[PDB]
Structure formats: structure tokens, C-alpha cells
RNA sequence: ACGGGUGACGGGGAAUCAGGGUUCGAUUCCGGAGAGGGAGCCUGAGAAACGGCUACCACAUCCAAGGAAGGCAGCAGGCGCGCAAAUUACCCACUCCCGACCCGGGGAGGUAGUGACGAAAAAUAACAAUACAGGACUCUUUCGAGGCCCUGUAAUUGGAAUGAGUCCACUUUAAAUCCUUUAACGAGGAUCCAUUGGAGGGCAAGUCUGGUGCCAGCAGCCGCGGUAAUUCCAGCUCCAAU
């Protein structure tokens, strides 16, 4: 055994979902002051712990 | 608009000159152009515009003010003989050859392989 | 330190002098067979020619067929083998071309499922395996 | 042998703990409450700070009536005093111990331009600032950064040629009032 | 001691650093050494000089085959070597040097070209009005309203701005370039489109979705992959620096 002849299997078959267009990102301080919006004015403490910010349960 | 005031005012009796720096004022507009600064100082100071060099000058920025050096003279002979030949040449009342520096060292070490009149006839 | 008096400055560093050669990580820096030994002799990255398109079997528990490459450095002569690392970049690497060589990242250790290989791939004939695999250039032909 | 001077000094320091939230959740309401581009701005002013805080830690190990540590440390004092961090009730070397990075980044250009109401906002004040509507002390000034000084302070104005100041109205108010009236001539 | 080794020119110094320390110093300053390797000398105040000579060794150029001419560890440049490094440019205007010299020469030096070694500053938006979600407020048991009052983001409308860029002129400068000054143009999805790496732990950041199914591959280390993968390969979103 040992084949070398199954070289990119996965990237070869998996299915090409292509990217979708989506809106431009804000960079630097425009991107520093929404980050700052974010998570220190718009936000309200939660009950025991707090949410994480990628959490989709 | 242009304004010109003069600093570090100095007499020099050793190449014959007064040297001054030159502070042109010119707010709202680019900067300003050497034969105006010229004849501007020439007023002020009451001397004839053909004796007068001014050079160096950086505009600050915002561009309110223009520092720069300028160097007057107490005839046009000593104007002509203790200067600077770029001065002079900006003036217009000298010229330089064109004659390259490659080219002329190449001509020098083709000189240098003939010995006695050879010299003036390796040329052209 | 155990001695201490005012003249025990020389047994001091002769003692500490002599001791360092006992640390393994002053030995092997200090002593030149393992420059002699190092495929690189000091140097970051080597180029080599591809001899080989191989497959080495991993390690216990983990079990795949990791693709690796013999190679020959220019600067030795000498055949190593690296690690092609990313899915499906064996394709982009042929037999007998000139690749460049970088450590894996545990200065001559084999690394994690892999035996004995402590190198791999970072360019293959004047352009990166990374920009292969993610599409910026194409292998020229 | 090139004439050359090659004195070049890093001015900022990057933290040994990269990912601590106990210091990002603090660097990043300083970036938001002053306005500040991105965290290398938060450590260019800490740097500063250490330098001030290092400089006042070995003039206090000295003892006092030794001139090196009398001339130092009234300097330092001094120049804390002129840029209006350090207070001149406390003009003491123990007192520089107590500063802080806020009062520092009080003192910036974008600071004092939205604190005396040139603008509305700390990132208004920014985008004034490098839009070349501000000087200070007839010298028009685009850099944020810029340590206002407690006597120069007074000084902070529009620019003269700025349409916020006594100027010609900018390109965008010009073009549409030309484009209007050389549509309707 | 002597000998051997040195990826040893030495030092001023460089990096890291609580306090000690450890590592580097071919490299712009000082001193040394050498001009392919050795050797030997002329002239001269000063040379065992090499952009001086003389051999021999190695390498290499021309040739009527008799003879002759060498020395880029100078500036460019080329080959080779390698992981690894720029233009066969312009000028004596500066700095200074040399000469019989106020006048000439200077790839020394200066100026540009290449230049993400590296360092400093600093764009990629800012603000009103409408929504809408909040807090704060008078009142209300609550369910709620209103707006005195703000903040947040919405592919909602909207004028005000400014820089990159194109470009007169001036300045700059040996002559230029560039910076700076300043006309004229120059932005709304301001497409004038910010990337690089990650998202189990360490270690900040999805147990989302699809495919794969100990294969492919990820994984610095622990580990993931065996048909319901928080770890592969992709989409979406988020995080870190910028
Ligand atoms: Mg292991
Ligand atoms: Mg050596
Ligand atoms: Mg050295
Ligand atoms: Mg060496
Ligand atoms: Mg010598
Ligand atoms: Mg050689
Ligand atoms: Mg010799
Ligand atoms: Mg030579
Ligand atoms: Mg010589
Ligand atoms: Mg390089
Ligand atoms: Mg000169
Ligand atoms: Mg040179
Ligand atoms: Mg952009
Ligand atoms: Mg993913
Ligand atoms: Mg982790
Ligand atoms: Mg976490
Ligand atoms: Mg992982």
C-alpha cells in the first residue's frame, strides 16, 4: 500500500460554493470606532455570563 | 499681496556684498519668482536689479512664508568675478559648455596614449 | 555556586565554563559536527532538484500517507526529504525541478505525524507553493 | 564614507501577552475615546510614558542637593508643566509616578480641536485636522498627534485658507455652483 | 605554557535586558592587513606600492606563430556561486583633497535610478435630516405614550469637504527630479473596491451550513479526521494586527 496516486482528493470533489459579493469593510479608525461602538456603547450586560460575539447556537 | 522683509542683515567688505535672508510673504499664492524677489529688495533697498542674487528659497507649510538666501553687490564686475557660475548662469550672463564629463575623460585617456603635438590632432 | 571567596573568580568561570558543555542546547551550537550534519549548514532555506515524488506512511494513532519529495540540495549535493504541505500540491511539484527547501519550524526535529522529515516546501521553479495553491499563479510551462 | 546621519529609533513597543482581553478591552476604549487609528498609537504614547516614568524612577534613587538630579529632574518637570500633563500644584518628581496615558492623549491636536468646539466630534476632529482646516499659531498643521502645549493652546484656530475659516469655498461647493449656474448660463 | 581550532581583523559600539548577564560587531569612525598566491626591488621624505617594476606559480587577452599585453577585495557592469544584495546614470554646485595652482583634475564625494533591510509621520471617510433599537427622563401597577434630551447602524435621502491621481507656473537644483507653494480638473455602491493569518485548548475569535469519511489533509505542542468533524476542504460570520 501507500498511494500516492489519491493526491488532492477532497479539494478535487468537494463542491465549489462560489463567493457571494457582499459590502465593503470600513478600515482603520472607521474600523477601530465601530469596534468600539460594538462592544462599549450599544451593548447591555446579560444575565450570568456575557454572549460571545460569533455564537449562532 | 507679496510682502519681503530682510534678516540677519550683513555687510561684507571682503567679496564686496551685503548678505541678507529674504522672508517673502505671499499669502494666497504659489511662491514667488527670483526676478520679482529681485526687484522687490531693489526697491527697498535702493539699488539697481542687475546686482542682486537671491537663491534657496523654501516655502513653509501652509504657505504663508518663503525663507531664502540672497547675496547683493556693490558693482556688476564683482558681481562677475566673486560668484558662483550656476548663479551667474541663472542670471543669464553666463554660459557653459555642453561638453559632457564621459566623453571628455574619454578624450583625455585617448590623449593620453600619443605623445607630443598628436594631442590636438586626436580630436575631431 | 558553593565556593565563594574573593580570589574563586577563575574556579568559577572554569567551573561554568566546563559546565556548559554538559547543556545539550550549548553542545550542538557550539560544537561544529552538528553544522557538518545539518543538511543546511546554517542557512535558512536550500534549493534542491526533485529526485523523487514519495509517500511516507505516518505515525501511530494518526494514520494517513503524508507526500513527501526527495530532494538533492544544490549547495551539498546532499538528498533530503521534505514535506509538500498543503492538499493536493504534489501536483504542482514534477520530477527533476528545482524547488526551495525551508525548515518545518523544530530546527532539525522530525514534526507531529511524520517520520525523520524536518523539512518542506516553500517555492517550486521560481514560484511559491502558497500562490500555487491558492490560485494567484499558475505553474509556468 | 556617505554623509549620512542613520539615527532612527523605534518609537513604540509592541505588549508580550498578544491576545490578553484584560488589555485589548482597555487599549480599544482609549482608541475609541480619543479618536486613534489603531493600537500602535496607544503604544507610542505608553512608550512615551515609560521613557517619562523610567527617566523620574532613576532621579529618585539619587539624593537630593546633587545638581545632576536638581537640573534633570526641574527639566523634566519643566517640560511636563509646558505640555500641560503635569499640573504646576504638583510640580514635584514623586508626582510624575501618578500620570497617566489619558493625560497624554489629552494633549493631542485631535484632542483639543474637539474640545474647543473647532469640531463635533473626536473623528470629526481628525478628518478636520488632515483636511488642512486647522493651525496653531499662524502655521497650518495636519497632524493628530501634534502635543499642544499649555501657552499655545490659545492659538488653535481655523486655517485661513479653509472654507470652514475666512477662504474660498472648497471644490465640491464650487462645482456644483458652477455646474447649476453654467447649466442655467 | 606549548599546540590545535575559530562561520576570529580588533576597538569605539549593536541587540536583548529588573539587578546581574547573554549574543553580535564583514560594515560608513580609529588602528591593522592585503590587492590572484608567494617572493624581490627601483624611485622617493614617506612603498617592500601593486590603477609601479621584476620573476616564478595559477588563470587569462592579441598574433603574419616572430612577439606583446595583464591584475575591478575602486565606480558601474557581467559570469559563476548561492537562501541571500541596486545604474555599464549626472555633476565637480557642496564637502574636502592634490598640483607650478583664485583658473585644472577628482566614480573621493555629492545628486538622482532600483530599493516593504529597517525607522518616523499618516488616507481608505466625516457630518446633518428621516427612520428604527436603546438608555435617560414627565407620567404610567403594568401594557404605554410623548418629546424636553442624547447615542448606536440602516443598500434611506442629502448637501458640505478633502486627499491620491491628471496637470500650468514658480521654487528646488550644477542641471533637474522629489518635497513644499499654487492655478485648473479630480468621489458616493466616495468600484478612487486592505490585506495577512487564524476561529478546540494554549490563545482573542461559531459547537453555523455543505462536502469528505483515519482518505484527503489540519496540527509549533496537546491533538482533529473511523458517516452527526467546534480542528480537513469551501460558504457565511467573527477575532487579531494593520
Ligand atoms: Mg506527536
Ligand atoms: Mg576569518
Ligand atoms: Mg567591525
Ligand atoms: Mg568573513
Ligand atoms: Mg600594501
Ligand atoms: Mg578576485
Ligand atoms: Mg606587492
Ligand atoms: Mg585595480
Ligand atoms: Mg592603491
Ligand atoms: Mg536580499
Ligand atoms: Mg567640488
Ligand atoms: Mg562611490
Ligand atoms: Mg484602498
Ligand atoms: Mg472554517
Ligand atoms: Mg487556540
Ligand atoms: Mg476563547
Ligand atoms: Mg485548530
Redesign the pocket.
Known amino acids: 500500500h501507500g498511494?500516492?496516486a489519491?493526491?488532492?482528493?477532497?479539494?478535487?470533489?468537494?463542491?465549489?460554493?462560489?463567493?457571494?459579493?457582499?459590502?465593503?469593510?470600513?478600515?482603520?479608525?472607521?474600523?477601530?470606532?465601530?469596534?468600539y461602538?460594538?462592544?462599549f456603547?450599544?451593548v447591555?450586560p446579560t444575565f450570568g455570563k456575557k454572549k460571545?460575539?460569533?455564537?449562532?447556537? | 499681496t507679496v510682502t519681503i522683509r530682510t534678516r540677519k542683515f550683513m555687510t561684507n567688505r571682503l567679496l564686496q556684498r551685503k548678505q541678507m535672508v529674504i522672508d517673502v510673504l505671499?499669502?494666497?499664492?504659489?511662491?514667488?519668482?527670483?526676478?520679482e524677489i529681485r526687484e522687490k529688495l531693489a526697491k527697498m533697498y535702493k539699488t539697481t536689479p542687475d546686482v542682486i542674487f537671491?537663491?534657496?528659497?523654501?516655502?513653509?507649510?501652509?504657505?504663508?512664508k518663503?525663507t531664502?538666501f540672497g547675496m547683493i553687490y556693490d558693482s556688476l564686475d564683482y558681481a562677475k568675478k566673486?560668484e558662483?557660475?550656476?548663479?551667474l548662469?541663472?542670471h543669464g550672463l553666463y554660459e557653459?559648455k555642453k561638453?559632457?564629463?564621459?566623453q571628455?575623460?574619454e578624450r583625455?585617456n585617448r590623449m593620453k596614449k600619443v605623445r607630443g603635438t598628436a594631442k590636438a590632432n586626436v580630436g575631431a | 555556586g558553593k565556593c565563594r571567596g574573593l580570589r574563586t573568580a577563575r574556579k568559577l568561570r572554569s567551573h561554568?565554563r566546563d559546565q556548559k558543555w554538559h547543556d545539550k542546547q550549548?553542545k550542538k551550537a557550539?560544537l561544529?559536527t552538528a553544522?557538518?550534519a545539518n543538511p543546511?549548514?546554517?542557512?535558512?532555506?536550500?534549493?534542491?532538484i526533485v529526485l523523487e515524488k514519495v509517500?511516507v506512511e505516518?505515525k501511530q494513532?494518526?494514520?494517513?500517507?503524508?507526500?513527501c519529495v526527495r530532494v538533492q540540495?544544490?549547495?551539498?549535493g546532499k538528498k533530503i526529504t521534505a514535506?509538500?504541505?498543503?492538499?493536493?500540491?504534489?501536483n504542482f511539484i514534477e520530477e527533476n525541478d528545482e524547488v526551495?527547501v525551508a525548515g518545518?519550524?523544530?530546527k532539525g526535529?522530525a514534526?507531529?505525524?511524520?517520520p525523520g522529515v524536518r523539512f518542506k516546501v516553500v517555492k517550486v521553479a521560481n514560484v511559491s507553493l502558497?500562490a500555487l495553491?491558492?490560485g494567484?499563479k499558475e505553474r509556468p510551462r | 564614507?556617505?554623509?549620512?546621519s542613520?539615527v532612527?529609533?523605534?518609537?513604540?513597543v509592541t505588549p508580550?501577552?498578544?491576545?490578553?482581553?484584560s488589555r485589548?478591552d482597555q487599549?480599544?476604549k482609549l482608541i475609541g475615546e480619543y479618536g486613534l487609528?489603531?493600537?500602535?498609537?496607544?503604544?507610542?504614547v505608553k512608550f512615551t510614558l515609560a521613557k517619562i516614568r523610567k527617566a523620574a524612577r532613576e532621579l529618585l534613587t539619587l539624593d537630593e542637593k546633587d545638581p545632576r538630579r536638581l537640573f534633570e529632574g526641574n527639566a523634566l518637570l519643566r517640560r511636563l508643566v509646558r505640555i500641560g500633563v503635569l499640573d504646576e500644584g504638583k510640580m514635584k518628581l514623586d508626582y510624575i509616578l501618578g500620570l497617566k496615558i489619558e493625560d497624554f492623549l489629552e494633549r493631542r491636536l485631535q484632542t483639543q480641536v474637539f474640545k474647543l468646539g473647532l469640531?463635533?466630534?473626536?473623528?470629526?476632529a481628525?478628518?478636520?485636522?488632515?483636511?488642512?482646516?486647522i493651525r496653531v499659531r499662524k502655521q497650518?498643521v495636519?497632524?493628530?498627534?501634534?502635543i499642544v502645549r499649555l501657552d499655545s493652546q490659545k492659538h488653535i484656530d481655523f486655517s485661513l485658507?479653509?472654507?470652514?475659516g475666512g477662504?474660498?469655498?472648497?471644490?465640491?461647493?464650487?462645482?456644483?455652483?458652477?455646474k447649476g449656474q453654467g447649466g442655467a448660463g
Not at chain 1, 6 to 35: I, S, Y
Request: hydrophobic share 25%.
Open positions: 498511494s500516492l489519491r493526491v488532492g482528493k477532497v479539494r478535487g470533489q468537494t463542491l465549489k460554493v462560489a463567493k457571494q459579493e457582499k459590502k465593503k469593510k470600513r478600515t482603520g479608525r472607521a474600523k477601530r470606532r465601530m469596534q461602538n460594538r462592544r456603547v450599544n447591555v460571545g460575539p460569533n455564537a449562532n447556537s | 505671499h499669502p494666497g499664492k504659489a511662491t514667488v519668482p527670483k526676478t537671491v537663491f534657496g528659497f523654501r516655502t513653509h507649510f501652509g504657505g504663508g518663503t531664502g566673486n558662483p557660475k550656476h548663479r548662469a541663472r557653459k561638453t559632457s564629463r564621459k571628455r575623460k583625455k | 561554568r550549548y557550539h561544529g553544522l557538518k543546511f549548514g546554517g542557512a535558512s532555506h536550500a534549493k534542491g509517500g505516518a494513532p494518526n494514520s494517513a500517507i503524508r507526500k540540495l544544490i549547495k551539498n514535506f509538500v504541505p498543503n492538499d493536493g500540491c504534489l526551495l518545518f519550524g523544530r526535529h514534526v507531529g505525524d511524520i502558497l495553491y491558492k494567484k | 564614507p556617505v554623509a549620512r542613520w532612527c529609533r523605534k518609537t513604540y508580550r501577552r498578544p491576545f490578553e482581553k485589548l487599549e480599544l487609528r489603531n493600537k500602535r498609537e496607544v503604544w507610542r469640531a463635533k466630534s473626536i473623528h470629526h481628525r478628518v478636520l485636522i488632515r483636511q488642512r482646516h497650518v495636519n497632524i493628530p498627534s501634534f485658507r479653509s472654507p470652514y477662504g474660498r469655498p472648497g471644490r465640491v461647493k464650487r462645482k456644483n455652483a458652477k
